[PDB]
Design a protein around this ligand. Structure first.
Ligand code: PCW
Ligand code: CE1
Ligand code: CE1
Ligand code: 8BZ
Ligand code: NAG
Ligand code: NAG
Ligand code: NAG
Ligand code: MG
Ligand code: RB
Ligand code: RB
Ligand code: RB
Lengths: 987, 261
């Protein structure tokens, strides 16, 4: 870009290259010409997103490319028929129109459910401009970050967001928040010297998104907008392309299963149809008729609404998904790669442990205050609490009485803010407590003095004397403390107490944490009266000999839900891996703190620490956990990495760049892993895009991370995720309940026609009617099967093996078509011939009859009783054979939906009335079937007539045949789940 | 390359047995379904709320009955007559032997099944009752003239009963063409264009194996030449519908007619 040299440059060389000055900045005339030259200092969004071509992609896919092929074959068939002059060629134009109408209205449904998904994301995003304090023509003032141009001179301070990529020139104790780019939760020191040649490790550059915590600095802009470090991570994260979702894989799997049957059924019944001696035009037009019945015109609809009800279920729990496929993905997901800083943690310095009264107390670290706080009963605390509260200069922004204290904005340092929040919660109205002990002398934290300190007058007026409070680097608090508060009294700081403060300081340093000492001293109102004048440079007060209060320590803590959430996913068969750009010590801590690394497991560097060997001679397998730092990961040929990954089951990756994050997911996806990543900052966006489902904190998340992610958690409730797996496995189980239902009936939609081809009986079932099944009668049942519950304890299973456990397969496929569809076919043919014989046509006569039946030029054909019917009366019986094959299906299909409720358990055991949505659906199924027959004019409008209430009941002894074949199937598969019968008769 | 070989058969035989199980259930159902229904009378016969009537000779072009012929050209009506002959080839008194010369001149309820092999009895309609359109004297049934005869027939329904008042006649007319010349005129055989009432009602192709439909003709005298007309032949009874829209052959026959000179 332009930067890999910039930090190594001299001020003479820099202000030459960008034609500026390190003191005065740009001339306004030139900073305007550069803004035109380089555009605005922001990030071009993924510029190409036309509204119409969003709808375009809502129309391709597994099922849709099938319907199109079928829709085309409906038009190829229609022309073929009218070319040799065929009548009611409507029925080819009705299926083509319905096939295309279904794929269209599905494309609309999702289009809004993205618009509304992406407007609710646009709702949660902040749109007030970030700001820079700039210098131009030697004038300091405020502007917006976006008008910064390459070469400008700016300033920063505690609170201001870093407005560009900036080179440091002078730094006064400047610390910064890098957790968006690096995983570094620790603040980072900024200084104008060249620490490195890679500008991500050097200290003399500030990055475009980062947050300045405490201190102040000044420097020059070196790259603006996309050309920043920030901007070039989305450029890769845009360059990343994401994989096809697991559910879409399982769709195009069975699309190819469906096609395979249509083809052979067309070909065989074309080769069959040629041996009945047809026209080649017609042995093959049936071929096309055959393949098109095998398309369920309405399965695409039932899936999209099944997903919507789970998509909506999640949305109610503050969990937004962009496209409905990812709704499933969590359930089938088997690996979670998780960002630490900002994702597993709160990314907030919180007070964790304290030392006083010779005891290491641990506080409540959580955001909602659900945890377990410490003993505040003793005197040493109230003094220690007074010290930390009074020796604190940070301040809350006004009007924050509502928001929980952890989520409030404080004008102050990193350490000072954490204590202020801690002081505010533990004591209550911290700001007002220290106001009533009026401050009269103060010393800033210092390079030469190395501590903070203040002296105060006291609360009640009957005490006229003063008190001094001091905190700082604990060893610099101890050299000047000769007295310690202990158990009420104030004791001498002897060699018991000297060696006991150094063990604790380095004990809490052992947890990586940042810790300060706190101390106090009461001054005499004789030497130091009301009206005394304290001077600093003349040390007219004690800078030594103080009474020690205690230590207080801070750390980046996990989010309250996270540790529970982590260990519920592990118990659901999902390995977790931390992928964090923080240093390996904080990594292992949070890893054990939440349950990435379990209580009682070790890295190889703990075995060689316990056994005290060199690490050289330790066994790898015996270490349950391992930590790999980002730069030793380079040395690893991936096949080394695969040895390590399945050998150390609890893995932790430290100091990993956005590139390595992507790699680790890629290395897992290469091993048949459905893996999801979770992140906040831009370091996650690449791996957030590569993942099978990327998840982004809707609050703590950077824009590129949320853009690249497929799912967003707006409440930042990490435990929203586990509710996702339960869903993703629910619909998965519940889809192969819903899908198996809508597929069975295609066979008794085809067999009446297949028999019609080869036996030439009067047409049993019409494409005017087979659509009313496909697209009206059987929809409410199929989508109710979303509301099936677990049968097992769904959350206590492994994720689905992608290869063995599929959405449909040869066992589930053959059972639904060729066994259940056969019974529904026999159920129709029986109800067919009854209507025939009972209205006049003997089944034996129905053989080969069709030629004269549909013949328009006969008007007096003799039935078996010798009665002569006109064509327009044979019509109304071929309509009755429609209506009678139709009700045969409905009485059979009402049995089909109940028996998919339960895939292993007996519907006795689970229940009949179980799914109250599934019950309400079926009343809808018979009610439209009643309207379709006995409404006035229904004979002519569609091909249905008021049928006699005898033919209703003829299929009912086939309906209840079905219930007791699958019952003794899932009674025999639960009672005898052995080898033979558990594979064949199970789906 | 698929599943287990020696157990592929162990399910391939199952599918076999599964299908013979279902086919036999079916086989029982049709055996019952046949031994359910009556072998002389239809159980419901629902779409037969009125009988179709059916003209001869039947020639359709597109869109329905289109009868066009040029009298001078023998070939234009040679097959039209030949069908009328080979149709009445069963209406010969020779072929119509197993029947009786009905006299009743009113309804004929046979409640008693007395005949060869427990059959029943049937009346007679031999060609001669059409008397002019019977192929004798004119084997062209008036086609050679320009006054062709069209045999009109009614569909036969078991135990259907059309009424008492008169005999059920026919009546053939234009679809009104009033201003253009006189109203149509036709003579019918036998008189008044009536099917005698003693031919009803039907007791099924099983009870009456030797049965034939009663006939009338319609010799077309008034007809103008080289001109397209349409002729409806509505039947005039009380148990009959002739205006049902979704089946216009219910109780009538329409046909385009062009007699060319
Ligand atoms: C993929 C596998 C497909 C395999 C399908 C095979 C189905 C074959 C099953 C049964 C066939 C019937 C067996 C016939 C023997 C049974 C007894 C019998 O003889 O009964 C009598 C009837 C005729 O009665 P009648 O006039 O003599 O009685 C006198 C009338 N009285 C009683 C009123 C006086 O015999 C008859 O009709 C003879 C004609 C039988 C009816 C023809 C029906 C054709 C329709 C076939 C569709 C089958 C369903 C396919 C579903 C496959 C789904 C994948
Ligand atoms: C195929 C093997 C399974 C056998 C199934 C048997 C079921 C059929 C039992 C029939 C028993 C005979 O009793 C007849 C009872 O009929 C009950 C319904 O009658 C109601 C009649 O409603 C008239 C229809 O109205 C529609 C308009 O009609 C014009
Ligand atoms: C098992 C194959 C089918 C055989 C049974 C067919 C059903 C028969 C229905 C009989 C209907 C009742 O008898 C007709 C007269 O009652 C009028 C009812 O309304
Ligand atoms: C499996 C199947 C059953 N079917 C029934 C009907 C039907 O009952 N009706 C109302 C009209 C016919 O009687 C129409 C179909 N139409 C399909 C549409 C796809 O392509 C073709 C191509 C060639 C021929 C056809 C017939 C068809 C059809 N297919
Ligand atoms: C009728 O047929 C004769 C002989 O085939 C022919 O000469 C005459 O032109 C025809 N009349 C009409 C109107 O076509
Ligand atoms: C007409 O009926 C007579 C009864 O008088 C019957 O004997 C005869 O068979 C019929 N006529 C002829 C010519 O057979
Ligand atoms: C019927 O035939 C007779 C003689 O065959 C004839 O006199 C009579 O006129 C014919 N009928 C008509 C309507 O011409
Ligand atoms: Mg982050
Ligand atoms: Rb279909
Ligand atoms: Rb505690
Ligand atoms: Rb993705």
């Amino acid at each position: 870009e332009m930067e890999i040299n910039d930090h190594q440059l001299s001020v003479a060389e820099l202000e030459q290259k960008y034609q500026t000055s390190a003191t005065k900045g740009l001339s306004a005339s030139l900073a305007a010409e550069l803004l035109l030259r380089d555009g605005p200092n922001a990030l071009r969004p993924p510029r190409g997103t036309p509204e119409y071509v969003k709808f375009a992609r809502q129309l391709a896919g597994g099922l849709q490319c099938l319907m199109w092929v079928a829709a085309a074959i409906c038009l190829i068939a229609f022309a073929i028929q009218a070319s040799e002059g065929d009548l009611t060629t409507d029925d080819n134009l009705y299926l083509a129109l319905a096939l295309i109408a279904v794929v269209v209205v599905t494309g609309c449904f999702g289009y809004y459910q993205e618009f509304k998904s992406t407007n609710i994301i646009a709702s949660f995003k902040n749109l007030v401009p970030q700001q820079a304090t700039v210098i131009r023509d030697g004038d300091k003032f405020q502007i917006n970050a976006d008008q910064l141009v390459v070469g400008d001179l700016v300033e920063m301070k505690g609170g201001d967001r870093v407005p560009a990529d900036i080179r440091i020139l002078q730094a006064q104790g400047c610390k910064v928040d890098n957790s968006s780019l690096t995983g570094e939760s620790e603040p980072q020191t900024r200084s104008p010297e060249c620490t490195h040649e890679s500008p991500l490790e050097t200290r003399n550059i500030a990055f475009f998104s980062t947050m300045c915590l405490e201190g102040t600095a000044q420097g020059l802009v070196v790259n603006t907008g996309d050309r920043t470090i920030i901007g070039r991570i989305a450029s890769l994260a845009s360059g990343v392309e994401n994989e096809k979702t697991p559910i879409a894989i399982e769709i195009e799997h069975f699309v190819d299963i469906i096609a395979g049957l249509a083809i052979l059924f067309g070909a065989t019944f074309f080769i069959v149809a040629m041996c009945i001696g047809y026209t080649f035009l017609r042995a093959m037009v049936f071929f096309m008729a055959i393949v098109v019945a095998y398309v369920p015109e309405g399965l695409l609809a039932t899936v999209t609404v099944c997903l919507s009800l789970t998509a909506k279920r999640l949305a109610s729990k503050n969990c937004v998904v962009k496209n409905l496929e990812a709704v499933e993905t969590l359930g089938s997901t088997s690996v979670i790669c998780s960002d630490k800083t900002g994702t597993l943690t709160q990314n907030r310095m919180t007070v964790s442990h304290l030392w006083f009264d010779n005891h290491i107390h641990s506080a409540d670290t959580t955001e909602d205050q659900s945890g377990q706080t410490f003993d505040q009963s003793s005197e040493t605390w109230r003094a220690l609490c007074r010290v930390l509260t009074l020796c604190n200069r940070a301040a809350f922004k006004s009007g924050q009485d509502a928001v929980p204290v952890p989520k409030r904005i404080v004008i102050g340092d990193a350490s000072e803010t954490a204590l202020l929040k801690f002081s505010e919660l533990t004591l209550g109205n911290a700001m007002g407590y220290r106001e009533r002990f009026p401050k009269v002398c103060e010393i800033p934290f210092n390079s030469t003095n190395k501590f903070q300190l203040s002296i105060h007058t006291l609360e009640d007026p009957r005490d006229p004397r003063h008190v001094l409070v001091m905190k700082g680097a604990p060893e610099r608090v101890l050299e000047r403390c000769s007295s310690i508060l202990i158990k009420g009294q104030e004791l001498p700081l002897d060699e018991q107490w000297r060696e006991a403060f150094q063990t604790a300081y380095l004990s809490l340093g052992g947890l990586g944490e940042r810790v300060l000492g706190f101390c106090q001293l009461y001054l005499s109102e004789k030497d130091y009266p009301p009206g005394y004048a304290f001077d600093v440079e003349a040390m007219n007060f004690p800078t030594s000999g103080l009474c020690f209060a205690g230590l207080v320590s801070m750390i980046d803590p996990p989010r309250a839900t996270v540790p529970d959430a982590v260990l519920k996913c592990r118990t659901a068969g999902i390995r977790v891996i931390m992928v964090t750009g923080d240093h390996p010590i904080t990594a292992k801590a949070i890893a054990a703190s939440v349950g990435i690394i379990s209580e009682g497991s070790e890295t190889v560097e703990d075995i060689a620490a316990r056994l005290r060997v060199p690490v050289d001679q330790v066994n790898r397998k015996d270490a349950r956990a391992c930590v790999i730092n980002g730069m030793q990961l380079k040395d690893m040929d991936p096949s080394e990495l695969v040895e390590a990954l399945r050998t150390h089951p609890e893995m932790v990756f430290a100091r990993t760049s956005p590139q390595q994050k992507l790699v680790i997911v890629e290395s897992c996806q290469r091993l048949g892993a459905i893996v999801a990543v979770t992140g906040d900052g831009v370091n996650d966006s690449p791996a957030l895009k590569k993942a099978d489902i990327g998840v982004a904190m809707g609050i703590a998340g950077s824009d590129a991370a949320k853009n690249a992610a497929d799912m967003i958690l707006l409440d930042d409730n990490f435990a929203s995720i586990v509710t996702g797996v339960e869903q993703g496995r629910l619909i998965f189980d519940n889809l192969k309940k819903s899908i198996a239902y809508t597929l069975t009936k295609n066979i008794p939609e085809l067999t009446p026609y297949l028999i019609y081809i080869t036996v030439s009986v009067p047409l049993p079932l019409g494409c005017i009617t087979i659509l009313f099944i496909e697209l009206c009668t059987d929809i409410f049942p199929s989508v109710s099967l979303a509301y099936e519950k677990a049968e097992s304890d769904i959350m206590h299973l492994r994720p689905r093996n992608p290869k063995r456990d599929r959405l449909v397969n040869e066992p589930l496929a053959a059972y639904s078509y060729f066994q259940i569809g056969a019974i529904q076919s026999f159920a129709g043919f029986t109800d067919y011939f009854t209507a025939m014989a009972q209205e006049g046509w003997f089944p034996l006569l129905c053989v080969g009859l069709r030629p004269q039946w549909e013949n328009h030029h006969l008007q007096d054909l003799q039935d078996s009783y010798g009665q002569e019917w006109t064509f327009g009366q044979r019509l109304y019986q071929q309509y009755t054979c429609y209506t009678v094959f139709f009700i045969s299906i409905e009485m059979c299909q009402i049995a089909d939906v109940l028996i998919r409720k339960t895939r292993r358990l007996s519907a006795f055991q689970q229940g009949f009335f179980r799914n109250r949505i599934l019950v309400i659906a079926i009343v809808f199924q018979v009610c439209i079937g009643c309207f379709l027959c006995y409404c006035p004019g229904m004979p002519n409008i569609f091909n249905f007539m008021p049928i006699r209430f005898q033919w209703w009941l003829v299929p009912m002894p086939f309906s209840l045949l079905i219930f007791v074949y699958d019952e003794i199937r899932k009674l025999g598969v639960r009672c005898c789940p052995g080898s033979w019968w558990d594979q064949e008769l199970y789906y | 390359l698929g599943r287990t070989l020696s157990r592929w058969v162990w399910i391939s035989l199952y599918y076999v047995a599964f299908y013979v199980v279902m086919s036999g259930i079916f086989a029982l159902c049709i055996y019952v379904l046949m031994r359910t229904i009556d072998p002389y009378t239809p159980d419901y016969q629902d779409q037969l709320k009125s009988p179709g009537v059916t003209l001869r000779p039947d020639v359709y072009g597109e869109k329905g009955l289109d009868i066009s012929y040029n009298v001078s050209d023998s070939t234009t009506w040679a097959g039209l007559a030949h069908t009328l002959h080979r149709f009445l080839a069963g209406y010969s008194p020779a072929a119509q032997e197993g029947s009786i010369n009905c006299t009743s001149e009113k309804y004929f309820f046979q409640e008693s099944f007395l005949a060869p092999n427990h059959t029943k009895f049937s009346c007679k309609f031999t060609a001669d009752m059409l008397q002019n359109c019977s192929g004798r004297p004119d084997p062209t049934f008036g086609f050679a003239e320009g006054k062709p005869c069209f045999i009109i027939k009614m569909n036969r329904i078991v135990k259907f009963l059309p009424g008492n008042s008169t005999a059920p006649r026919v009546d053939c007319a234009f679809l009104d063409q009033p201003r253009d010349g006189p109203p149509l005129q036709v003579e019918y055989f036998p008189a008044n264009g009536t099917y005698s009432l003693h031919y009803f009602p039907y007791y099924g192709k099983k009870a009456q194996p030797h049965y034939s439909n009663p006939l009338v003709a319609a010799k077309l005298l008034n007809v103008p030449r080289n001109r397209d007309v349409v002729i409806v032949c509505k039947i005039l009874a009380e148990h009959v519908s002739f205006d049902n829209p979704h089946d216009p052959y219910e109780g009538k026959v329409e046909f385009k007619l062009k007699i060319q000179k």
